[PDB]
Amino acid sequence: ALSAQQLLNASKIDDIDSMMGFERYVPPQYNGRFDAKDIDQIPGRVGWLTNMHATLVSQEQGISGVDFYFLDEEGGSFKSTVVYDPYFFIACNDESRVNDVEELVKKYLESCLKSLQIIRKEDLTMDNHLLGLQKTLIKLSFVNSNQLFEARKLLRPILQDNANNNVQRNIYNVVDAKHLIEDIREYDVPYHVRVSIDKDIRVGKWYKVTQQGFIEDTRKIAFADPVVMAFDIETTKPPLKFPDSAVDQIMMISYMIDGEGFLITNREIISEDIEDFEYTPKPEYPGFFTIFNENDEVALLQRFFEHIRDVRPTVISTFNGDFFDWPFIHNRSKIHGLDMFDEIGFAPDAEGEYKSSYCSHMDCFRWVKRDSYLPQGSQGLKAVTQSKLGYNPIELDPELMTPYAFEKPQHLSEYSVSDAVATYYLYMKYVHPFIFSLCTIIPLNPDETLRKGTGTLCEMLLMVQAYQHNILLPNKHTDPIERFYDGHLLESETYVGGHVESLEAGVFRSDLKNEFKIDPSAIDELLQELPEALKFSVEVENKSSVDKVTNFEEIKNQITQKLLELKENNIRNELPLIYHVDVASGYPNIMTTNRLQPDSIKAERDCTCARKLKWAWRGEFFPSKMDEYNMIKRALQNETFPNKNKFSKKKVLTFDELSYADQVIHIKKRLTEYSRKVYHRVKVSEIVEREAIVCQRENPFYVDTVKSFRDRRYEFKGLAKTWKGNLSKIDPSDKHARDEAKKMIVLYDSLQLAHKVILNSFYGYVMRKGSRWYSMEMAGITCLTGATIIQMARALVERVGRPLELDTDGIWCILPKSFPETYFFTLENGKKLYLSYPCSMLNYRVHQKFTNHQYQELKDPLNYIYETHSENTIFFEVDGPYKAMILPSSKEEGKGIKKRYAVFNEDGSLAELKGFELKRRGELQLIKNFQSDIFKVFLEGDTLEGCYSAVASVCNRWLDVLDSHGLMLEDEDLVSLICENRSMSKTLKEYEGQKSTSITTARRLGDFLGEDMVKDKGLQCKYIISSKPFNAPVTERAIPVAIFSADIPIKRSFLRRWTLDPSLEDLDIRTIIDWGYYRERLGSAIQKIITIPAALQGVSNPVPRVEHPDWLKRKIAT
DNA sequence: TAACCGCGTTC
DNA sequence: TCTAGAACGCGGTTA
């Protein structure tokens, strides 16, 4: 009877919408033909779709439908409602008797079923579906979703029983219609997704709402301009603690509406009335903020709710507002006897996020977290503003927030409007165009398009294709609770992913000579392939013909000579060429080349059309066999356990009474113990080479969806490279032009990276939990193939140059200055074709060794005729040459550091900075600032030995800071330089039985500040490592840096407690630091970046105060 | 030493 | 309920 609450909320939503200008529109009646070619003749209203929600409407019980919120061409707004019967399917194990099943379900579901019907869809798991055979299904249609759910509850027992054996009575006897129900299908599709897919309606498109339905207006494709608002709230706060929606109150709320700024102030906390002012951090971001100095918090809350109600915003944007701002405003409204929903139509949803019916809430922190491609260290508003808006917003220590409400209140007002300016323009410039364009292809509304996982977005895209090709959706994947290998219980299984190699460390610079040993057989190979490779570069790499290029022979000879000079002088000491080669959309193009997709992975039983491809399976299992396995379960069966309902008539249960899971949970622990004692190892790892069949004739709806999104992303990736060239062609004095060109580059880099995470997820989706198209084989084939290609390329580079670092699909390398480099074919039309010989030599070989010659495609659908052709879209791309690249080395013998380096452009700017602590979130600020100071200095110096001498100076100055026990620095730069920060993904209760600096910091923070400090995850544990107690583990000396700002009484007690020294009176931070610990941290940094890499290049220790490891001193002494 | 964990990176 | 993947560096504990 929950329909009541649902029918109720619909009427509430209907009224809130009309209050905001969204009255329900019903179009005139029309009896002429429905043809989009006569859109101007059909009666109806034209609007721009801005939102969609599922609703329960009565005619004038509840009927399911979808509310579609529009903005019209006359500056007005409205909404329209489409109704559509929810439905799912019943599949049969005997197609000749579906009418019996049909007759049974029509009576068994007499209560909730509205209609039924026999439908055929294409099933990709069925024999002969490639010849036109279809699956026969019963389409069960309902009046609303509540009825659909009841049928599923009524059908699951029949599905549970039909796989639970048949209770027999007369044992001497030799089919029921119930047993003909194989499974239910397409039952877990969200209703609004179902309507958006079947009706082909997308937010962001123009439609004409007529009686016949929605007619897309393809004549207009430019978005209408909604009313957009962004807001930031700032609240008082207990010193050294977090705000509380109960005790603390909102000081002020800054916001901007379509460009115009505002600020409401609570004058019971703000010491003075604030006067209108301007914060325009850059000319392109105007910010004229009118102020509203209200009396009390209640008055502030009512100005906000009244302004919102008057401007009527279809989009409201925040930064982390779903988990702070909106809940704070909601609790402050409740305490003050205000109801947020009745006032602004906003209320928390099933996951604690605040949404409305008429306005989309766009938390920009969701975009940053999912689509920015920004590291977690750079996901704060300040870092996002710097990177994406090109300036520094106003800063303010959060401890100073509540005091400055009284002492310096104008400064507080400037900070709040800074956060406001950043959020509005971040949304309008970045989040708004991306999400609303994405809505035009994804059947979700803006709220969900921004928030759903990228694997769900991929699933949404694939379901469209599958539906529009009449392909039956697979049910969501499910793992077995237990899987076994050679009698051992498996802990985990996966595939061998990407191949990563650390090949060389040290300093490499375009002006510092390097030693090259060139394989003369490699040069002989390149010369044998040269003629065809340049023909390949002309015709395949440039979509051209060798006839129209006029200087083909001159280029051939020029490269030939340079090659031959290298074959005679194998040993060479030349300047380097620091280049990067990487496959463009590697895993996508690997997939499309090999026709990879989950429905193409076939067994030998179920299928020339077959292309055998290899992958590596890796499993982690216990060392115990089955004989041992069953022994522990028997012992667990005799044991008794506590009941999950703490309060129950009963208070204990048996194993067999426990969930098959909790059971396996207990089996896991005991099995681990037994393996640790009898075997001494708890987990055995094994890699098994496997081979899979990929049918080259299967319905390619998946791989076509990847290919289409690949081409979608490439448009923005290409525009970014186009504008990176346009900026290089503008004269340096022509400012503004460079400024707009740089803005275009940041725009298209961002857009293409935001598509890259979706493109990335098309690869990961086949391994996602709940994936409708699961395939471990397809992913393993993709990874192994890329590893085969990247090492073939390394083999060639090894023989004509020095590869430095290798990762998955990319290689960093130095090549001789005299290696064939860049050439330009000239066409009869004067058009020039670019040629990077290092690139095209790899791509010709790639297309010799990895082409798919078995790719098939439907030529004639009516008579099912396939044609085979050769497909290969795997190409290396190239960037460089660069000024410098710095790769660190390990502290251990014969070991490298993968995934960490720094690359510098010829102009001196930083190109790439990978992996280093400087980039990661948290880490020790000392190591952060040291790395920040060091990498630039690697460009100074006239020789390699003089280069290391330049960095050594910074090093010794930083060692001087620590050898001096922080006497040099003022009090601040110390507390800031020696603090280490770490985040806790869970809360501290969830780390039971674990030792870590963050755990110790969190517990000590709670004993001194209260249990409210650990009530939420994501805590920022800021700590220093104390010297005392001596000889104690480091996790036992982590002191939270908040104590040194606490009142003396608390400081001494806890300090004394934490140092195990009750006689301590000296409380000065510098006397508490274990400076030897930090001196060792800096030493390891200097060791891995400077000293050991220098030794590997034959340079005496440039920082002798950092002693070499004993293995390195012995290696040089011999 | 070597196994192992949490966090946050590079792909 | 909703939920893309694996390989890797490093500080730190623990067989």
Ligand SMILES: O=c1ccn([C@@H]2O[C@H](COP(=O)(O)OP(=O)(O)OP(=O)(O)O)[C@@H](O)[C@H]2O)c(=O)[nH]1
């Ligand atoms: O977050 C990520 C990044 C990368 N990958 C996977 O790593 C592969 C190689 O990682 P790349 O960064 O080279 O991606 P790409 O080739 O698709 O992009 P561009 O070089 O054209 O810029 C990608 O093709 C993808 O499958 C992920 O699965 N997730």
Ligand SMILES: [Ca+2]
């Ligand atoms: Ca803020």
Ligand SMILES: [Ca+2]
């Ligand atoms: Ca790539």
Ligand SMILES: [Ca+2]
């Ligand atoms: Ca690339």
